[PDB]
């Protein structure tokens, strides 16, 4: 349904990117005639994994999970870009523009704090 | 006058204040304990069991 800022704002929804029926398993065709551009690209970080430093001795460093502490400020949406058609037949987004960054900061066992610059720029 | 080795026995015929000092000495342990883990915790590298374990530190 088509909803409203009022019916959104402090849910946390504002924070998710939109989703599609269990029954959307069908397909795209792409008429390699024809030109092509993604509308609204969106992506929302469900967890965040860092890389323990392996201390001197080592042997393998794992991606422990963190803990956010910024909030639902972490997604990144109306992002856009022309979606090629390759000649091997591949396609190809080239993002043009977007809110393409968000800084997140997660905490680790520990409590150290971890910031990153959460993004897709071009 | 009671010496000073000898204070404490003012508590021998006295039930409630000897309780009262026992109280006193449990809470003291207790709290110690309390203060030694914390110290503990403020020094201790929990990152290496390996070859940093607690029993180096
Ligand atoms: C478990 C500890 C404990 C307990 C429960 C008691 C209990 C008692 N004492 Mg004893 N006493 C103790 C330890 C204790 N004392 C110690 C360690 C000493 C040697 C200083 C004495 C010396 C003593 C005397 C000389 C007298 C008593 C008396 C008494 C009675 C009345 C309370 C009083 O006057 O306190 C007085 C005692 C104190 C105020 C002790 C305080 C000690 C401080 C807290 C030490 C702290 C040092 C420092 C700040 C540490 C911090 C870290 C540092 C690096 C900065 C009561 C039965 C009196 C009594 O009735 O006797 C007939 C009395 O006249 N006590
Ligand atoms: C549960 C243990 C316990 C208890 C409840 C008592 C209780 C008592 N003792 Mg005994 N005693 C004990 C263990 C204990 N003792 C042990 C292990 C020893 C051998 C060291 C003695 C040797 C001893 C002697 C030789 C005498 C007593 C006397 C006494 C009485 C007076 C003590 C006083 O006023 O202190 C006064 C003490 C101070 C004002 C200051 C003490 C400062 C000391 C030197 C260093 C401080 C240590 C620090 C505070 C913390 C303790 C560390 C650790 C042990 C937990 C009292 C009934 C006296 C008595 O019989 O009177 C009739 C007496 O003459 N005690
Ligand atoms: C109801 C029967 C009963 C029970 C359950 C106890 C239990 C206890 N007595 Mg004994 N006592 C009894 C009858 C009883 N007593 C009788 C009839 C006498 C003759 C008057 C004594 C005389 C006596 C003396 C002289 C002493 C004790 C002490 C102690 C305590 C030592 C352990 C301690 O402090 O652990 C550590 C404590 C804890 C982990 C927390 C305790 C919290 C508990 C659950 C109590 C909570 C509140 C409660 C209503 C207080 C009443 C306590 C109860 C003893 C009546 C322990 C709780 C010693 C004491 O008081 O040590 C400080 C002590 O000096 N008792
Ligand atoms: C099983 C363990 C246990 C036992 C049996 C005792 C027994 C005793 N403690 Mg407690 N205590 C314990 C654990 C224990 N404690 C722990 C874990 C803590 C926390 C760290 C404490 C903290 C504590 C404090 C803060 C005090 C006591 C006190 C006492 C005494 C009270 C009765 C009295 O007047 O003695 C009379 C005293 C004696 C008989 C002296 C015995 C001497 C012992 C062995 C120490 C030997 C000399 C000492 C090592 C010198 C210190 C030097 C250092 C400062 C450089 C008694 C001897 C009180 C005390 O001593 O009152 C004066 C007191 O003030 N203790
Ligand atoms: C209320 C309940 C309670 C609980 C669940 C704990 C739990 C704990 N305490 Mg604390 N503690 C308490 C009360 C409590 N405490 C109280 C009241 C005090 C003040 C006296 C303390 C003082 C204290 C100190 C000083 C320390 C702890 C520590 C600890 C940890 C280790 C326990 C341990 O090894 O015990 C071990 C206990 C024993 C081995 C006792 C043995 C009993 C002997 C053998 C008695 C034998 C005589 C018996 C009466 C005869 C029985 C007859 C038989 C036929 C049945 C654990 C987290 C330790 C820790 O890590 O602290 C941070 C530590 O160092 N505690
Ligand atoms: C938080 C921790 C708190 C810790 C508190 C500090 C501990 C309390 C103070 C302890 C010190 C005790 C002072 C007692 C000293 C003093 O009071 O002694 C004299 C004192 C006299 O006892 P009387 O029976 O005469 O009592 C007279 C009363 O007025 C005493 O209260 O005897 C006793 O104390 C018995 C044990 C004496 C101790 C003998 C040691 C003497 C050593 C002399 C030789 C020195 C070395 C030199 C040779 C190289």
Redesign the pocket.
Known sequence: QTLTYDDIVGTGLANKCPTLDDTARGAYPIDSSQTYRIARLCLQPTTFLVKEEPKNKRQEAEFVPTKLVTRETTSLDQIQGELKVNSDGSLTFVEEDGIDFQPVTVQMAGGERIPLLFTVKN | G?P?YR??T??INDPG?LIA?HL??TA?VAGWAGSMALYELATFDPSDPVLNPMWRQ
Request: hydrophobic fraction near 75%.
């Open positions: 009671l000073w204070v404490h003012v508590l204040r000092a006193m000495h003291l």
